[PDB]
Amino acid sequence: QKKKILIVVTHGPEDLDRTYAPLFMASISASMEYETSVFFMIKGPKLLDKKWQEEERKKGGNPFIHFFDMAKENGVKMYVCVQSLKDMCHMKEDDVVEGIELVGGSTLIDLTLEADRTLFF
């Protein structure tokens, strides 16, 4: 049975330095053939804003965008906490980039129980 790694991202662009590592780690994990998921919450959802990502892609040089894309290429599954998205980040569900599963906080409990190990950032 394949082992499962969950990575929790709780910072946004206000602290970008804390957002690179987790996504690079997600690619590393995936490359080692672990089924790897990332869960965005608290300010994490701001990293998934369509307009912010488009801005950063156009500017270039954003390491979060680089590692986000690498994680996606490596098959990393991604989730965003809707209570964080709406109530903490003041985003709409439609503001989230495609391919991220919108879930409630209960899903974090399920995902951490289902994973072999969870990393918190």
Shortest distance (Å) from residue 54 CB to a second copy:
25
Dihedral angle sign, alpha carbons of residues 20, 66, 25, 113: positive
Shortest distance (Å) from residue 61 CB to a second copy:
13
- CB neighbours of 58 closer than 8 A, spacing ≥ 6? none
* Closer residue to a second copy in complex, CB, 54/101: 101
Could you give the CA distance from residue 86 to residue 81 in angstroms, rounded to a whole number?
9
* Closer residue to a second copy in complex, CB, 46/72: 46
Could you give the CA distance from residue 60 to residue 112 in angstroms, rounded to a whole number?
34
Shortest distance (Å) from residue 60 CB to a second copy:
17
* Closer residue to a second copy in complex, CB, 74/112: 112
Q: Using CB under 8 A as the criterion, which residues of the chain lie in contact with a second copy when the complex forms? A: 3, 5, 8, 10, 17-18, 20-21, 24-25, 28-29, 32, 34, 41-43, 83-84, 88, 104-106, 108-109, 112-113, 116-121
Could you give the CA distance from residue 72 to residue 85 in angstroms, rounded to a whole number?
20
